[PDB]
Write a protein that binds this DNA or RNA. Structure first.
Ligand SMILES: [K+]
Ligand SMILES: [Mg+2]
Ligand SMILES: [Mg+2]
Ligand SMILES: [Mg+2]
Ligand SMILES: [Mg+2]
Ligand SMILES: [Mg+2]
Ligand SMILES: [Mg+2]
Ligand SMILES: [Mg+2]
Ligand SMILES: [Mg+2]
Ligand SMILES: [Mg+2]
Ligand SMILES: [Mg+2]
Ligand SMILES: [Mg+2]
Ligand SMILES: [Mg+2]
Ligand SMILES: [Mg+2]
Ligand SMILES: [Mg+2]
Ligand SMILES: [Mg+2]
Ligand SMILES: [Mg+2]
Ligand SMILES: [Mg+2]
Ligand SMILES: [Mg+2]
Ligand SMILES: [Mg+2]
Ligand SMILES: [Mg+2]
Ligand SMILES: [Mg+2]
Ligand SMILES: [Mg+2]
Ligand SMILES: [Mg+2]
Ligand SMILES: [Mg+2]
Ligand SMILES: [Mg+2]
Ligand SMILES: [Mg+2]
Ligand SMILES: [Mg+2]
Ligand SMILES: [Mg+2]
Ligand SMILES: [Mg+2]
Ligand SMILES: [Mg+2]
Ligand SMILES: [Mg+2]
Ligand SMILES: [Mg+2]
Ligand SMILES: [Mg+2]
Ligand SMILES: [Mg+2]
Ligand SMILES: [Mg+2]
Ligand SMILES: [Mg+2]
Ligand SMILES: [Mg+2]
Ligand SMILES: [Mg+2]
Ligand SMILES: [Mg+2]
Ligand SMILES: [Mg+2]
Lengths: 185, 159, 172, 183, 58
RNA sequence: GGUUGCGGCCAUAUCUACCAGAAAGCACCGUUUCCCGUCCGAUCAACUGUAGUUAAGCUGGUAAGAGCCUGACCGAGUAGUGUAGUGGGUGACCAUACGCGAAACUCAGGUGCUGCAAUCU
RNA sequence: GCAGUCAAGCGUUCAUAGCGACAUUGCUUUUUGAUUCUUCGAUGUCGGCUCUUCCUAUCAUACCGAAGCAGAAUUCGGUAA
RNA sequence: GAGAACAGAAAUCUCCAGUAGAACAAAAGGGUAAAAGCCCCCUUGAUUUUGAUUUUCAGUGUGAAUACAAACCAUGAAAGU
RNA sequence: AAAUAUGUAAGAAGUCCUUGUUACUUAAUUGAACGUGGACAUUUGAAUGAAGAGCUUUUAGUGGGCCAUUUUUGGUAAGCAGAACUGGCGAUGCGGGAUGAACCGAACGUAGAGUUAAGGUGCCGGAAUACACGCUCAUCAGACACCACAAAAGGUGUUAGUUCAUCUAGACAGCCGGACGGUGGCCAUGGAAGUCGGAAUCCGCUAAGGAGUGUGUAACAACUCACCGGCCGAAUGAACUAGCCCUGAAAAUGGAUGGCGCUCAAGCGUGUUACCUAUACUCUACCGUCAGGGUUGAUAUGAUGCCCUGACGAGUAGGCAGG
RNA sequence: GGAAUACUGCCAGCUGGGACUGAGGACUGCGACGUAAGUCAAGGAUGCUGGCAUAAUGGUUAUAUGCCGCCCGUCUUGAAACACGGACCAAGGAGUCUAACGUCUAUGCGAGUGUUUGGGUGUAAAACCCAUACGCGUAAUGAAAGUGAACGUAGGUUGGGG
RNA sequence: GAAAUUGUUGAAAGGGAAGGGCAUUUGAUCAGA
């Protein structure tokens, strides 16, 4: 017998492959597994890790977010890498010329980038151009802006968006939400 | 029925330190507490205002707020299986500066001075405290100290 | 606790700046090994003087061999032991060739006759009785008579085999 | 040391040998029914299995740990022969969180060469003479998995103190015999 | 029928299963209960310090 | 070094009984128009510093003094206690091992130290 | 409920022939309680009648010891179911 | 405790000692002596706004309490409260 | 005023120096808080460890507990009832305690070998009718903790001790002699002379004799002993202490150190070895799991593949996964 | 006075007997011996020989023997229980579907998204095509009237993968 | 044309159940080379 100081047979808790059955995503995962194994590039390692992520862990990255990242000082000529979907954003009116590598481009985002004069390329094209992730800039979308997130941690004095189907007066606003009816939260 | 009041079971805890009753001496009010100071909590039974709860007697915390006659103290209270942050508003009579950190600040000053003098003299640091080491070899002389032989004594009552 | 050896143990009551070179107390301990000897030394020192192992140190431990291990001697042994209901001082006499053999006999006899375990016994003193007629126990006196002879009746020989064919005899 | 003892005796003094700087501790009690504080101390000394042994550098801080776990371990002062045989036969290094046998000096050099330890005898030296990098060398050494003693424990009952005719506690010099029989 | 009233048995084991976690000390702790007059002045002090630092970039 | 004002620690400073105190200071002390307060100029208030005194306050000293304070290989490694055993004992309880370790008791020593400011034989 | 230990006293004298205060040590499970472990998809709930066996803390019978046992009667006790 | 007409054990007056052995609404515990007790003077902070905190605690509620902020006040010579 | 338990600290979110902001604060750049810039990286400021650390969501079962050591309340107590800390059983097999939920040992993938734990080694039954010093004889012996009971009080049973005494200037025991006088001492009583009772506790002769140790008398008288002697000639006496054994010790079907049986034990106390054997420990193989890695540089179709390395494996309720 | 021996400990001293294991499968490594060739006990067994070539080994099965083994399910702190169900066997026999939802995951598109109420069409309940709306989202807050999200490089500081 | 249950035949075992686990003997039977 052994006085175990930790749980036995504990799985790492991290994805080692995509849950997706997408054959093209599996091919990309194979390519970047080879790259992360035989290039020693931290970019390649993090891209391989990101290729496994679920949909909520790959929030969309908007072209406006990409434009701000390019407005970062010294990053104007870097290849923007998004392991996920790049979405269009009409709230921005001046998009710069840049090369963006992404899993997916929406029609509007691809049109905006190409019209501004850049190119939308796949992750394998990115791997061919920069096998060590040279001059890359990895962008991630907002994870905690999801609708599900605001209901997380709900409780007294948390301000955490009660789970509710109908909103308005008469819907969870009277007792426990104001001092005039019992107490406030 | 049962009784769990605010000052329950404080009978001896909040006593006045026999033959030290009466007015609080002025050094207690002349102490100065700044945010980040480390203070031990010991309630004064003669000062009923700004009093800590009995749980915080003997607890050491960090001052986070300073007011006219009180300080705010941060205590990590064990609740269930984790520690919760607690903010006590304690009049200065119930707190004093913790000497567990004035000595540490003196040690920090001494370490900085020793590092400066070492960088001036040569190459040696030895700046970490070490536990009590096993004793080195020694020679014990018998000159004037011839070993005296003891034996266990016989039993007797002497009552 | 086992076959016994005698040790001299000298301890110091560790020195300080105020009192260097403390009084170097010594005892003679009967123990089966040096660890037990030092443990017993500190036990008795805690019984005698204001000191403990943490505040003292063993200056020396030396095995004391019998000076004449092949000379038959009579030993007077003064012991103090705890019975089931009290503490008692006793004097006994043991004939043997060494102090360690006499002490082993003493422990065996105390266990056999008073159910006194090792933990319950203090060896106050062991001293050779140099002169006959200073022996005051009959069970030792009877072995000090001139030209002592005695037979060994009813000799029981151990058989190596399960069965014997002879109906053996106990002559000696 | 021998000549210092002789010289003190000739001068009429007593040579008090330096207190031992190294102990070897072996867990002699199973993993059931252990109070939480001694259990934690055993885990921190890496004795998580019966007949698991480790070297401990003697200070007040570790002497108190040995005091806390006295009823569950047999410990003492290991000799150079005991240490050499332990490292030679049951010497394993912790490399990438793995138990790798010390079958080559390159294995020791790759993990401890930054401390000046280049060989199995370098490691043995760092253990026997408690050097500046004793902590790193000892932690590199995987806990020694000894067998039950070949000639038995020498006592009918293990779980009283060595002084009381048992097996646990400080058995200062007899730990060499016990560990050699266990090796 | 009467039953058990109370016991703390097994409670420390349950708590230590997931451990007694220290509460994640942060830099820049909250100013929740800090004296509001001090907080009002500190807001302006931080405003002025940021202004001075930005203006120092020439 | 004395003394005063303000103090810090709050008896090593307190308490009982005696003795002494140069200089200054403090004090008692002298007076009742005014401010003020009293049954009562006793206290409190105001005035003089003059009429007098160290009697008391105060300060220091004395006492095989009470108390208090300090230390002790004094008691005592005692009481107690953490840990251990398929130890003892019918039990009550006790012993031993690895550790921690009092209080009373006894003995000896001590009896305010000190900060700022001012003043003084 | 039954049995001891001590022995102030009772017993004309005499603590213990027979008793025995104040105390104290026990045993038993034929009292009654205490508890709620078993049984509530059910162990037939008083007593008597009948019949067998067991225990001994022995009423009688056998043989004995002691007595404040002259005899007679009786009492205490032993081995004994 | 020592004294003073009626006046004594207890009306009132005076001095001495008095670490609280009294009192502070109530139960008990704690606390308090130029006070937290007694007497006197002035008063309404037992007010307004809404937050933070402690105990119970799920770190919900309620009760109770603590320290501030913004006012308006009370008292005091004032610091303050 | 402990022991145990318990809060905090042992640094880079630090320390030191200079000076920026503010409506706060101060008599006042005085301070407060937050900073710019500069200096300090071998021990960055104790030990030990760290199948990594931190974090989030969502759901199952559960919400009758019980036992052991220790602390502890009610109760006479309880296999009772209620708390504290821990370890356990529930949920757990395995070796041992004959047997048993909880005790001891040890926790469990499938096997091999070795060594052990607790417990044992006369036979059942694997293993010394081992060694060694003692103790015990029971016409109810005793024979391993939890645990399956026994007490006060006793015993020239036997053993070992403590203390005080007597003794070759003759100890104790044994047989025989004496055991007086003052004196029926005084008093209570109808009578009480040494002896139903109170006080006085004396001497002469004395080796020695008590105003009395008992028997006896209505009181006497009379035997008797303390006390001293004759004979023998060396150890003896008293009160205690605690070991084993015995008495105390009585229940119901016939029966339980587990049984047999065991007596310089096969019992009790103790010590030394040798030996036996757990699913424990050590080494190896194989299965699976987990982890860390190698390998699309081709034929080479199994990169979810092949391969290398290390560690691990108990399980009710329950969850998940692969089939 | 000079030794010896015991006891304890050490040797990278030598050597005999016994048992279990032989994993791996070109080479690569670390070594040793040798001047060097090479050889080796050095990153896991080979060499030589015999018998048999089938029920001989082995499997299965019945029985015998040694030791072990209480009746499952269930409620329960505790079941083999003198607790409950069960004489036996076959077949049937119990977390389903639906409306609306939380988390997580996959997929499509993405500031939008949802063709299928309906229309068109059809090889006819299929597949294929489609307008206007509507639902949810893109704005919140307030009881409501109502108002309604850039001082700044959509801010500053600390940490932060890349 | 199953099982429970049953007849006959054949084989085997059988001192107050039977059934099971490990291991091998014996009998029967059989695969692989
Ligand atoms: K019933
Ligand atoms: Mg395992
Ligand atoms: Mg106190
Ligand atoms: Mg109040
Ligand atoms: Mg062996
Ligand atoms: Mg053993
Ligand atoms: Mg309950
Ligand atoms: Mg006057
Ligand atoms: Mg005045
Ligand atoms: Mg005078
Ligand atoms: Mg005095
Ligand atoms: Mg134990
Ligand atoms: Mg019925
Ligand atoms: Mg019936
Ligand atoms: Mg009878
Ligand atoms: Mg006042
Ligand atoms: Mg329930
Ligand atoms: Mg109950
Ligand atoms: Mg259950
Ligand atoms: Mg278990
Ligand atoms: Mg038993
Ligand atoms: Mg195995
Ligand atoms: Mg046998
Ligand atoms: Mg007795
Ligand atoms: Mg036996
Ligand atoms: Mg024996
Ligand atoms: Mg893998
Ligand atoms: Mg499992
Ligand atoms: Mg030898
Ligand atoms: Mg092979
Ligand atoms: Mg065969
Ligand atoms: Mg059986
Ligand atoms: Mg029940
Ligand atoms: Mg069952
Ligand atoms: Mg039953
Ligand atoms: Mg039922
Ligand atoms: Mg039925
Ligand atoms: Mg069916
Ligand atoms: Mg048909
Ligand atoms: Mg059929
Ligand atoms: Mg029959």
């Amino acid at each position: 017998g052994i006085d175990h100081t930790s749980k036995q047979h504990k799985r790492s808790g991290h994805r080692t492959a995509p849950k997706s059955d997408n054959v093209y995503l599996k091919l990309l995962v194979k390519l970047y597994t080879f790259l992360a194994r035989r290039t020693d590039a931290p970019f390649n390692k993090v891209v391989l890790k990101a290729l496994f992520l679920s949909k909520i862990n790959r929030p969309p990255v908007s072209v406006s977010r990409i434009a701000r990242a390019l407005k970062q000082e010294g990053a104007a000529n870097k290849t923007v890498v998004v392991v996920g979907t790049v979405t269009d954003d009409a709230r921005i009116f001046e998009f710069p010329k840049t090369t963006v590598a992404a899993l997916r481009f929406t029609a509007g985002a691809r049109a905006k980038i190409v019209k501004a004069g850049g190119e939308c390329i796949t992750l394998d094209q990115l791997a061919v151009r920069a096998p060590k992730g040279q001059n890359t800039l990895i962008l991630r979308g907002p994870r905690n802006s999801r609708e599900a997130v605001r209901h997380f941690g709900m409780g007294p004095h948390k301000g955490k968006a009660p789970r509710i189907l109908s909103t308005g007066r008469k819907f969870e606003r009277a007792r426990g939400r104001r001092r005039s009816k019992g107490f406030k939260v | 029925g049962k009784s769990h009041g605010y000052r329950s079971r404080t009978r001896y805890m909040f006593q006045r330190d026999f033959r030290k009753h009466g007015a609080v001496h002025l050094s207690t009010y002349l102490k100065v507490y700044k945010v980040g100071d480390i203070v031990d909590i010991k309630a004064n039974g003669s000062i009923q205002k700004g009093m800590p709860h009995k749980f915080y007697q003997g607890k050491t915390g960090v001052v986070y707020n300073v007011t006219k006659s009180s300080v705010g103290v941060i205590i990590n209270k064990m609740v269930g299986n984790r520690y919760l942050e607690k903010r006590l508003n304690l009049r200065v009579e119930h707190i004093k500066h913790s000497k567990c950190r004035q000595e540490f600040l003196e040690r920090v000053k001494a370490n900085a001075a020793k590092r400066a003098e070492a960088k001036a003299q040569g190459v040696a640091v030895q700046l970490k405290r070490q536990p009590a080491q096993p004793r080195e070899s020694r020679i014990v002389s018998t000159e004037g100290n011839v070993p005296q032989t003891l034996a266990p004594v016989p039993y007797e009552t002497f009552i | 606790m086992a076959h016994f050896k005698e040790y001299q143990v000298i301890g110091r009551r560790l020195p300080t700046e105020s009192v260097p070179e403390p009084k170097l107390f010594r005892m003679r301990i009967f123990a089966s090994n040096e660890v037990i000897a030092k443990s017993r030394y500190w036990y008795f020192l805690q019984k005698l003087h204001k000191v403990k192992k943490a505040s003292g140190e063993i200056v020396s431990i030396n095995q004391i061999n019998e000076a004449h291990p092949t000379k038959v001697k009579n030993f007077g042994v003064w012991v103090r032991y705890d019975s089931r209901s009290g503490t008692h001082n006793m004097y006994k006499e043991i004939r043997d060739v060494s102090r360690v053999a006499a002490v082993e006999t003493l422990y065996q006899d105390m266990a056999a006759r008073h159910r006194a375990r090792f933990r319950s016994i203090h060896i106050l003193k062991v001293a050779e009785i140099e002169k006959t007629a200073d022996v005051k126990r009959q069970y030792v006196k009877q072995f000090l008579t001139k030209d002592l002879k005695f037979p060994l009746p009813h000799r029981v020989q151990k058989s190596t085999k399960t069965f014997s064919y002879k109906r053996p005899s106990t002559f000696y | 040391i021998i000549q210092a003892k002789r010289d003190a005796k000739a001068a009429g003094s007593y040579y008090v040998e330096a207190q031992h700087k190294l102990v070897f501790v072996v867990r002699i009690k199973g993993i059931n029914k252990i109070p939480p504080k001694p259990r934690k101390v055993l885990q921190l000394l890496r004795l998580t299995r019966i007949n698991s042994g480790t070297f401990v550098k003697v200070t007040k801080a570790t002497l108190e740990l040995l005091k806390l776990i006295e009823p569950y371990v047999a410990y003492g002062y290991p000799s150079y022969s005991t240490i050499r045989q332990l490292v030679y036969k049951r010497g394993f290094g912790k490399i990438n969180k793995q138990r790798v046998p010390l079958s080559d000096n390159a294995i020791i050099e790759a993990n401890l060469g930054k401390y000046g330890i280049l060989s199995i005898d370098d490691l043995i030296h760092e253990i026997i003479t408690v050097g500046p990098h004793f902590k790193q060398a000892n932690n590199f050494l995987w806990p020694f998995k000894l067998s039950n003693p070949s000639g038995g424990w020498g006592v009918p009952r293990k779980f009283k103190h060595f002084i009381q005719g048992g097996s646990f506690g400080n058995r200062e010099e007899f730990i060499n015999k016990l560990v050699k029989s266990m090796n | 029928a009467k039953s058990k009233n109370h016991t703390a048995h097994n409670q420390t084991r349950k708590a230590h299963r997931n451990g007694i976690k220290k509460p994640k000390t942060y830099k820049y702790p909250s100013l929740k209960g800090v004296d509001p007059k001090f907080r009002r002045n500190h807001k302006h002090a931080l405003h002025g310090t940021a202004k001075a630092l930005a203006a120092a970039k020439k």
